[PDB]
């Protein structure tokens, strides 16, 4: 089935987060994983898989066991944005990323063109590329916030000149979406918010369209 | 290993300007706050100017606002502080310092504990 689209209440609202912005905004800043066909070396508990990626350990987090299951000892592609503080390890963490190497690889660049809306509005859309047949939802949504945090300011130091937002993947008739603003509250905590990746969704480079809808204050 | 290597400096009559200069390697700055503080003669250490990674957003101690300016250039690894009208209080020596927390700020302007690498540091002097 599709996600039904956000209730009226539903999405976070940046007004109510009264914390540092920083700390979301340093998750779509330049620093990120991305390692091509590499196989997993090591495993600290059954649903993680660890990669060497110099060289760092980083600690790959799913959802369970079938998906470290899965990819352990795959030669894949790692691709997300990891976090630091509080990783849990015994280096960096992160969340699903991953996806087969052998038979994933386009000769040519993909293009992703993200619709940005303002309140209903279009007034930006812009390119994502991948090299990937199936792509993980959390390195297109990296890319689209990549080039709004640079260009729209969607995260600044302190908060957000928007007070929603969220960013809806379409595959022919389902789609689905994630809220892209912090819980409410006065502390952002990063491995909590980015635990939303550890399903390791996946979506076709080819059908996919990405659509984000913002709301101003 | 990390490594933080302060330069410049110097001796300057009051109201001169100096620049310091922080050579890092052994880390990417860019996944870190950064700081500079000092340490006057018989005095502990006393922050002076954070710079969050991206460089949007400057701190500064209330002695040294409007004089001092914090920079970085994370290509090159550097960071950097332009000291203005100086002050004979302003005689220390100066230290470059690196948060102890990768991708995070948990406290702005940053607490001096919350840098857990400093350089051997650079005399500032404004002879009197």
């Known amino acids: 089935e599709s996600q039904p689209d956000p209730k009226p209440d539903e999405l976070h609202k940046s007004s109510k987060f009264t914390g540092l912005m920083e700390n979301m905004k340093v998750l779509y800043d330049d620093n990120h994983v991305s390692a091509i066909n590499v196989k997993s070396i090591d495993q600290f508990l059954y649903f993680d898989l660890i990669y060497s990626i110099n060289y760092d350990n980083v600690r790959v987090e799913f959802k369970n066991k079938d998906l470290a299951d899965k990819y352990k000892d795959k030669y894949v592609d790692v691709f997300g944005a990891n976090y630091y503080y509080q990783c849990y390890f015994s280096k960096t963490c992160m969340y699903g990323g991953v996806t087969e190497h052998n038979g994933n690889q386009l000769d040519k660049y993909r293009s992703i063109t993200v619709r940005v809306f303002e309140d209903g509005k279009n007034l930006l859309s812009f390119d994502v590329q991948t090299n990937k047949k199936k792509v993980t939802a959390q390195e297109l949504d990296y890319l689209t916030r990549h080039y709004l945090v640079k260009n729209k300011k969607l995260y600044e130091f302190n908060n957000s000149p928007y007070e929603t937002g969220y960013i809806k993947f379409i595959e022919n008739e389902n789609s689905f979406w994630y809220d892209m603003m912090p819980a409410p509250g006065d502390k952002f905590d990063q491995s909590k918010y980015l635990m939303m990746y550890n399903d390791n969704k996946m979506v076709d480079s080819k059908d996919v369209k990405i659509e984000v809808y913002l709301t101003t204050k | 290993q990390v490594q933080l290597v302060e330069s410049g400096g110097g001796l300057v009559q009051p109201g001169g300007s100096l620049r310091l200069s922080c050579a890092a390697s052994?880390?990417?700055?860019?996944?870190?706050?950064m700081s500079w503080v000092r340490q006057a003669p018989g005095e502990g250490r006393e922050w002076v100017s954070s710079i969050n990674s991206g460089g949007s957003t400057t701190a500064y101690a209330d002695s040294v606002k409007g004089r001092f300016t914090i920079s970085r250039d994370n290509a090159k690894n550097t960071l950097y502080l332009q000291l203005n009208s100086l002050k004979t209080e302003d005689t220390a020596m100066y230290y470059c310092?690196?948060?102890?927390?990768?991708?995070?700020?948990?406290?702005?302007?940053?607490?001096?504990?919350?840098?857990?690498?400093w350089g051997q540091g650079i005399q500032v002097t404004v002879s009197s």
């Open positions: 310092a690196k948060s102890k927390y990768p991708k995070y700020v948990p406290t702005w302007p940053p607490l001096l504990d919350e840098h857990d690498y």
């Open positions: 052994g880390f990417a700055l860019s996944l870190y706050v």
